[PDB]
Amino acid sequence: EDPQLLVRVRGGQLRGIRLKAPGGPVSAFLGIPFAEPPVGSRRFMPPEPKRPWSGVLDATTFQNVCYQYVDTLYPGFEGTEMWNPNRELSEDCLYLNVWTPYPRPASPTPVLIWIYGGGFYSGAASLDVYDGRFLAQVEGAVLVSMNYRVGTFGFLALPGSREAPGNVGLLDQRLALQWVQENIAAFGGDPMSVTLFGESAGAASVGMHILSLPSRSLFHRAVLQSGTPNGPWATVSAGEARRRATLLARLVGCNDTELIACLRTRPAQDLVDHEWHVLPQESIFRFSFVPVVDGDFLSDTPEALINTGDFQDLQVLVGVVKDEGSYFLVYGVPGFSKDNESLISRAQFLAGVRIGVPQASDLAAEAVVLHYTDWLHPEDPTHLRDAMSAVVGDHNVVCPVAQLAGRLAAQGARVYAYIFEHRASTLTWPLWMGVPHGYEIEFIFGLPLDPSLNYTTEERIFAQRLMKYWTNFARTGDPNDPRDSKSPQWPPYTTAAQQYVSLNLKPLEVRRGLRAQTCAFWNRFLPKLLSAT
Amino acid sequence: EGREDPQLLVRVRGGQLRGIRLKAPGGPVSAFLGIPFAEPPVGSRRFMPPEPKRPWSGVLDATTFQNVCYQYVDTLYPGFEGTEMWNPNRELSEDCLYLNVWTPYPRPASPTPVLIWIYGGGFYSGAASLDVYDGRFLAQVEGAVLVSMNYRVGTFGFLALPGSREAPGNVGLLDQRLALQWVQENIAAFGGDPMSVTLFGESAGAASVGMHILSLPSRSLFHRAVLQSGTPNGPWATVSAGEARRRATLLARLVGCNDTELIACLRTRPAQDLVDHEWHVLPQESIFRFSFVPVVDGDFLSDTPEALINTGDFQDLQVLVGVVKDEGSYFLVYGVPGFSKDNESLISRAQFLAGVRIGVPQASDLAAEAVVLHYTDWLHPEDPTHLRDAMSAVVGDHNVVCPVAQLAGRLAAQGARVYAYIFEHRASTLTWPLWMGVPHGYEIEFIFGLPLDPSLNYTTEERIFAQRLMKYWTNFARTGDPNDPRDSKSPQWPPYTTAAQQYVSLNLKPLEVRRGLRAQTCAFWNRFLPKLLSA
């Protein structure tokens, strides 16, 4: 019985496992229950604290993945399968994971808490890309990741109802945050230095904890990678949420109480089978069951809340990858595929815009086409292809990120912004997709340090730089290495100067204006245009 | 005659003329100035189509410029060369339908290509007698036969009650046309070739040239065309019949006046009374908008110029079009608060938003917002220097650059041979401040070859530049191609096409080929803006 792997938390004793990282051992405590299993009458319900247990709970292995849709686009293809569930699916899935250095830290150590993405319909803390052993070993970090309910199980809402109030997946996240406050000291973590970080829907989740009062005592700093609470996909109105929930009910043979009672009788896969039939338009980068603006978890729209808050106590690191939109084109836009260069016609570009901007009126669509067309070469297939990616990337990620950065900075927050531009040498997607949504993550987590993965020696060094930025931020609220010069320094993002840095193999380069002209179009003009219809 | 210069005596259809021997720097030229081409459009003839000049007896003296058509005189900067150079330099009169002819001395023995200049001035002003339109240099250096005519402007030339007999509209354009017909009949007497006639004009004159391209009865009267900083399409060059009627009746009201009775009352009014009130009839506070302009009538123009350049077969057409570097700047000091020739005109964001409403008076709030969105530098949204230059760009692109780009692309798509330029040289002699750059109208002195005048103090390099441009223009007039065939050495000027969109830069450096005439920005003005107005 290794006493380094034996921990007492409030619920009882745990036994972890000594894992090997390339440079030494780490302590891993995997599959710790933080909630009562949300099964049976508990489906759609807020999470309840896990009851205490007897003896020593085995925490040597990952627990089940929250029940979710599984991707079938490219079966066997690593580019897609890397995101697919790597453990059995179950509604019994509210478990978290803790990596610490071996042996347990001598002094209280800053905690990083990872919240996975996956469009609020998918994801798991057990994925190889979220492996916290490298950060734990190299940077001495205490890293936590939790599973949270996704899809209908996490976000089906009949706003106002008792039995499906909505946002329970976010409440799963919050309960794990509370668990960290109560228990992390036993692992050598400092509950007074907690940094949330996440990507895509996980970044949006991080943003919603910033905007939700009861979450504010649970962390001190935040990193939002390629995702925001504001924007076109991260939330729905109460009316649209109810609309989608009732439609789904009808589809599966089902007042709120009776409707939800019937839904709870249905096998999990029946719900998943019909998850995608409730979207109002044919679209991409749009998800059926996402957080709802209810007046509860969120007192108002994220756009409203980031515009009025006092965020002076907040430090935030936000950024995007070079090609945010490319991943999504192969999943719905005719003409795109990972198996060719996806050179498209102008008719295909126009068709793609209606799909990429599903809420657009004819005039709004024309405006987007006008902005992104190269009028010198308006029929060039290479430009039209890359512009289609830009439309989806800017609309859904880059410009909402720029807006969040600008808004938070204006309201007194300390903001650092980045663009991640390095394409992994081991990338399995074709060249035209560039640096796609999600492909900075393997570097932040230090996967190039894994000798079995065949990253270049430059990529190993690049990864260590990023781990240092991230952990320095967690420690200080400042990614800058507090012992360096001639670097150059990573300056805070401001509304005026709008400074951000490029993250690639080259040293930091300071740039100004995050797609400033283009994002002014998306953030300022487009809503006017939709309002006028 | 008998004791006079026998080389200055010429007969035309109306009778005998006596011209004058002028000195140009390289030698003498023949000038026949103030030749009447119409009966004076006075009294009962006011607002009426011109009637051909009835033959006169004896030898008419054609040695001096004639009257300027009655018009508003500019008062913004008294005694300032920058404005006064455009002001009338002869007596203002409704008796103003006269034309001028410059030829080599002695007159060419073989038929010589003819250039016909049509002045601009927003259809409310201008004269063929201005020093910047002096035809002696083109005549002497290039051997050109150059003709320029006065045409009625303002109410006198363009007040219209569409459908009426007594004020049918577009009579200023009919004046121009009558002059073209005069050239067809008489220019051979001067050594000119009526089978090789090239029209050129700037601003409203360029728009006029475009009207003649689009009007059927003008089409046998010329063979090639040059449009400098002006087009028949666009927001200022024409008004609808309903708006022309609206403006005419309002003007009538303002001077104390059934169309026949209204026009009859208008004819009793002193010329100056019409001028004193002509600027009170614009529907909005604006710049680059003129009260009395050509009207879309179904007659002179069978449809809007926009429709006409979209459906025509223009295979027979060779056309040279272009713009200057800073089309918008001149207009800012005349209507937008914060702008002046006497300071650097750095403006606030509030002054920029207000200027946009004035520079785009037809715009709804949403359209104006779109313009502001497009022209703002969102990295420095309140930078006064950028806002000032952006305001200029808004006015220049909207009124000139993008209508020119549209005209070039449309005509080329319909089969025409198009050559396009941007003129980027600022004269060393320019009296306007530096922030205005190369303003509307300031390529003209170079085309006409004024730098060749020793007394004007242009640089040696500017003299050479001027001679280059005169060659481009006369080559085009002669052949429909501005390039010199014997010079395969010097950079070639390629035709503008929709596919490649090639145009050249005109400056002190050799020709440089560029592609896309403000492609993104003009796509906004030409394609999107109209959609936005409709919604």
Ligand SMILES: CCN(CC)CCNS(=O)(=O)c1ccccc1F
């Ligand atoms: C979490 C990183 N992410 C980065 C792409 C991969 C995971 N899938 S997804 O939800 O984003 C998604 C979107 C569209 C189509 C399929 C799909 F899985």
Ligand SMILES: CCN(CC)CCNS(=O)(=O)c1ccccc1F
């Ligand atoms: C014909 C050359 N043009 C080139 C500028 C100078 C003549 N003035 S204008 O009609 O264009 C004009 C416009 C606005 C305000 C005053 C004004 F005279």
Ligand SMILES: *[C@@H]1O[C@H](CO)[C@@H](O)[C@H](O)[C@H]1NC(C)=O
């Ligand atoms: C790429 O692949 C898809 C499906 O495989 C196809 O529809 C598309 O036409 C291809 N692109 C080409 C042929 O340019």
Ligand SMILES: *[C@@H]1O[C@H](CO)[C@@H](O)[C@H](O)[C@H]1NC(C)=O
């Ligand atoms: C320049 O002059 C104009 C006209 O007098 C005035 O409106 C403007 O405020 C002046 N600008 C500056 C910076 O002095």
Ligand SMILES: *[C@H]1O[C@H](CO)[C@@H](O)[C@H](O)[C@H]1NC(C)=O
């Ligand atoms: C140029 O020559 C001299 C400069 O010394 C001056 O007297 C004359 O007025 C100038 N001419 C013009 C048109 O500026």
